[PDB]
Amino acid sequence: SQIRQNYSTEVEAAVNRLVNLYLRASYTYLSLGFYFDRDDVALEGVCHFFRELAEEKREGAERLLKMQNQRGGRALFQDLQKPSQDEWGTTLDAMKAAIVLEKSLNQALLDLHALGSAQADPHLCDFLESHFLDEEVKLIKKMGDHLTNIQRLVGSQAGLGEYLFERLTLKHD
Amino acid sequence: SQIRQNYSTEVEAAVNRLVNLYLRASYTYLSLGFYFDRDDVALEGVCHFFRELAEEKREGAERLLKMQNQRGGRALFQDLQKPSQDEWGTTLDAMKAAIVLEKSLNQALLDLHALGSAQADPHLCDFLESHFLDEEVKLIKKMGDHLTNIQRLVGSQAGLGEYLFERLTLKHD
Amino acid sequence: SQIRQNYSTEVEAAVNRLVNLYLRASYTYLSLGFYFDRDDVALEGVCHFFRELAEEKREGAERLLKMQNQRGGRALFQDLQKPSQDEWGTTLDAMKAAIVLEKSLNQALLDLHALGSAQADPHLCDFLESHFLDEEVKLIKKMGDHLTNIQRLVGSQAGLGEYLFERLTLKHD
Amino acid sequence: SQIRQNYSTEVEAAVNRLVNLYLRASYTYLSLGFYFDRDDVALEGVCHFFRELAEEKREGAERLLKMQNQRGGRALFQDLQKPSQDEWGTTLDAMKAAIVLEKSLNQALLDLHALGSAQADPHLCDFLESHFLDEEVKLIKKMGDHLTNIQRLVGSQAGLGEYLFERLTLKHD
Ligand SMILES: [Pd+2]
Ligand SMILES: [Pd+2]
Ligand SMILES: [Pd+2]
Ligand SMILES: [Pd+2]
Ligand SMILES: [Pd+2]
Ligand SMILES: [Pd+2]
Ligand SMILES: [Pd+2]
Ligand SMILES: [Pd+2]
Ligand SMILES: [Pd+2]
Ligand SMILES: [Pd+2]
Ligand SMILES: [Pd+2]
Ligand SMILES: [Pd+2]
Ligand SMILES: [Pd+2]
Ligand SMILES: [Pd+2]
Ligand SMILES: [Pd+2]
Ligand SMILES: [Pd+2]
Ligand SMILES: [Pd+2]
Ligand SMILES: [Pd+2]
Ligand SMILES: [Pd+2]
Ligand SMILES: [Pd+2]
Ligand SMILES: [Pd+2]
Ligand SMILES: [Pd+2]
Ligand SMILES: [Pd+2]
Ligand SMILES: [Pd+2]
Ligand SMILES: [Pd+2]
Ligand SMILES: [Pd+2]
Ligand SMILES: [Pd+2]
Ligand SMILES: [Pd+2]
Ligand SMILES: [Pd+2]
Ligand SMILES: [Pd+2]
Ligand SMILES: [Pd+2]
Ligand SMILES: [Pd+2]
Ligand SMILES: [Pd+2]
Ligand SMILES: [Pd+2]
Ligand SMILES: [Pd+2]
Ligand SMILES: [Pd+2]
């Protein structure tokens, strides 16, 4: 209790929930990544795109935890539920699932920001702005762009389009 | 009056008060620093920790003054009261006094931010966020950590614990 | 099914279970790390030791998943249960909990190796040997050493001993 | 006979057979490589992929021979039969033939390892593990991945898919 100042029990609880959501997202991306690495799926560009996102979500959770400790709150961890699917279908299906996931994280961030604004907590506000809200927007725009390109490349020749997208948009170094 | 825009007389007065509080804090840290440099106290790690904080508070006051001029307000200086003590007791006593001081500065920042939000002044809001609120949080967490370690090192052997903290946590380059 | 060769359904299931155990361990270390970063605990050496172990357990899970895909098995993820404690007591308590955890992972590795030897699967054997069994042994020896030193430093002056261990054994760069 | 120790006549014979199988494989890859270099086939990415595999199989045979001499066994060479085909069809046909070949080599390695484990010959075991079993697994996963991508790229437009795979997956420096 020695440092805690202007940090409500409600914000503290909502930051712990958000941490669980970011770790859940990280776990979802780990599964997406290993799915595309299956010898019967074998799209390497799609597998590391999803593995970079896993790392990013884990880092987001870690930033939230550091902040919680900086404000004198107490981290409380809960079970992490498994990803929503065991098999993720096509690149199109996966990118759709990813956007749905990012939008749910975005909405949780907005819900937390609204809470902090109602709680008169400008530090929370500035933290969430500078570290999460803009990265989320940029990420969702990128996924939106990917999805449009995937979608354009379907019809008639789906195997061909899925290969070319991975080779020409996704793949790497 | 040629540039001043959306900058109330109330915010202007509160920024001048905050400048006085930061200079008061800087002066308090100058005294803490020279106290630990006394030949009958002689803890050099504690003396420069407090001298870096003096510089930081002075710079915070200077940032506020620059902003006041940028917005077309007018700096007005008042007498600076002397620090609350002439002798600061133990490292434990001093770190406690320092935390009390930072928390009072933090609360003044929150009070100013609330004022600026009530005044519809988003520039003030962004200024205080990006430059003061987060640094204050980080500083108070660091002092909290120090205090916990000091506290742990007492009982039975206080001289020994105060020496070891200065040597092993504080001291320097 | 195009590549899978000499890889039983039993080994595949046991590798998925082991992956869950390594991720659980990683999560346990994340919680231990943030616990020691609390302003009312404030032992930084203990916090990053535990954060390096979190990364190591995550990497172990990832190595297992890559192997599973190399052999044509299918990764299946389950819920990750939360760590066994919300508060981890002293450095001594924490190091004890860590050793218990590593020994349970070690035993799971031995159980999997025995399975693979009973299944006539020399690739599994060589994989587990070269990548997990020796690292586990080395890690447990290191934790054992830490625990002995912690234990030596208690009696009479526990706060002092816990500070000195963190400063002189643990802490860092 | 001056050095030979714990090395059975049965293992020695099986190592000579395995050497013949690796040289046969190397010869098969030499033929696959020159087939794709025909002016009426002309897929350069597919031709050097197969030429790197020829070199790798030759090196595997050479490693086995060196080991045989290290253990005091005697290399005995037999006729090398010609590859199973004179013309290898499409890239798809060829990659399928390659996987069949690697899996037969893998099975021969497992059969030799089982022999050495039944013969109480831990050196053989460690040799085969560290030098052959893992490389074989990794190679077969890579071929599996290739085959999946080839397969995806067929239907309707086979010429186009075979060109794009060679250009975008296979080809080189
Ligand atoms: Pd506290
Ligand atoms: Pd991958
Ligand atoms: Pd990648
Ligand atoms: Pd990847
Ligand atoms: Pd990658
Ligand atoms: Pd990348
Ligand atoms: Pd706000
Ligand atoms: Pd905000
Ligand atoms: Pd704000
Ligand atoms: Pd003016
Ligand atoms: Pd000094
Ligand atoms: Pd100093
Ligand atoms: Pd000094
Ligand atoms: Pd100094
Ligand atoms: Pd310094
Ligand atoms: Pd505002
Ligand atoms: Pd603000
Ligand atoms: Pd604002
Ligand atoms: Pd398969
Ligand atoms: Pd830390
Ligand atoms: Pd550390
Ligand atoms: Pd740390
Ligand atoms: Pd660290
Ligand atoms: Pd380290
Ligand atoms: Pd074995
Ligand atoms: Pd083994
Ligand atoms: Pd073995
Ligand atoms: Pd001999
Ligand atoms: Pd060629
Ligand atoms: Pd080539
Ligand atoms: Pd070639
Ligand atoms: Pd070439
Ligand atoms: Pd090459
Ligand atoms: Pd063996
Ligand atoms: Pd072996
Ligand atoms: Pd062995």
- Domain locations in chain C as residue ranges: 1-173
Contact residues on chain A for B143, CB-CB shorter than 8 A: 3
Topology (CATH level 3) of domain D1-173 = Ferritin (1.20.1260)
Report the residue of chain C nearest A80, measured CA to CA: C80
D-side interface with C, Cβ within 8 Å?
A: 99, 103, 106-107, 110, 113-114, 117, 125, 128-130, 133-134, 137-138, 140-141, 143-144, 147-148
Question: What is the rounded distance in angstroms from the CA atom of residue C94 to the CA atom of residue C147?
Answer: 10
How long, in residues, is chain A? 173
Compute the half-sphere exposure of residue B159: CA atoms within 13 Å on the CB side of its CA: 1
Q: How far apart are CA C55 and CA C33, in angstroms?
A: 11
Contact A60, A132 (CB under 8 A): yes
Q: For chain C, how many residues are written?
A: 173
Closest Cβ opposite residue A83 in set C27, C35, C77: C77
Q: What residues of chain C have any CB closer than 8 angstroms to a CB in chain D? A: 2-3, 5-6, 69-72, 120, 122-123, 125-127, 129-130
CB atoms within 10 A of CB B84: 12
Ligand 22 centre from C55 Cα, in Å? 12
Give A-chain residues touching D165 at CB under 8 angstroms. Answer: 163
Instruction: Check: CB of residue D102 under 8 Å from CB of residue D136.
Output: yes
Do residue C163 and residue B141 have CB atoms under 8 angstroms apart?
no
Residue B25: Cβ within 10 Å count? 23
State the Cα–Cα distance between residues B145 and B112, nearest whole angstrom: 27
Set of chain C residues whose Cβ sits within 8 Å of the Cβ of D118: none
- B/e letters for B112-145, b = 16+ CB within 10 Å, e = fewer, are bbebbbebebeebbebbbeebbbebbebbbbbbb
| Ligand number nearest to the C-alpha of A120 | 7
Nearest ligand for residue D170 CA: 30
The ligand with the least distance to the CA atom of A131 is 8
Residue D54, φ and ψ in degrees, nearest 5: -55, -45
Give Dmax over CA atoms of chain D in angstroms: 66
Chain A residues whose beta carbon lies within 8 Å of the beta carbon of residue C3: 39
Distance CA(B127)–CA(B119), nearest Å, equals: 15
CB atoms within 10 A of CB D160: 13
Residues near A9 by Cβ (< 8 Å), separated by ≥ 6? none
Q: Spell out which residues of chain C touch residue A23, defining contact as CB-CB under 8 Å.
A: 27
Q: Do B154 and C156 touch (CB under 8 A)?
A: no
Find chain C residues with C-beta within 8 A of B103's C-beta.
none
Distance of CA A166 from the midpoint of ligand 15 (Å): 51
Beta partners for C80?
A: A80
Note residues around ion ligand 13 (Cβ under 5 angstroms). Answer: B 47-48, 51
Beta bridge partners of A80: C80
Contact B59, B7 (CB under 8 A): no
Q: Which of A56, A68, A52, A55 is nearest to A14 (CA)?
A: A68
CB contact under 8 A, C38 and A80: no
| Three-state SS at D25 | helix
Phi, psi of B84 (to 5 degrees): -70, -20
In angstroms, what is the resolution? Answer: 2.1
The C-alpha angle with vertex C52 and arms to C48 and C55, in degrees rounded to 5, equals 140
Q: Residues in chain B, how many?
A: 173
Cross-chain Cβ contact B147/A2 below 8 Å: yes
- Tell me whether residue D59 is annotated as binding: yes
> Which of D112, D123, D129, D147 should one mutate to test binding to chain C, selecting the residue with the greatest count of C CBs within 10 A?
D129
User: Rounded to an integer, what distance in angstroms lies between the CA atom of residue D96 and that of residue C64?
Assistant: 27
Chains C+A touching (3+ CB pairs under 8 Å): yes
Residue C135: enclosing H or E segment and its boundaries? helix C134-152
How many Å separate Cα B56 from the centre of its chain? 7
Residue C87, marked binder: no
> d(Cα D93, Cα C88) in Å, to the nearest integer?
60
Closest ligand (CA of A117): 7
Q: Which amino acid would we find at residue A59?
A: E
Listed residue (B76, B71, B72) closest to B18, CA to CA: B76
* Assigned token pair, D162: 């075979």
CA distance D82 to chain C (A): 25
Amino acid at C118: A
Helices then strands (H, E): number in chain D? 6, 0
Helix (H, G, I), strand (E, B) or coil at C129: helix
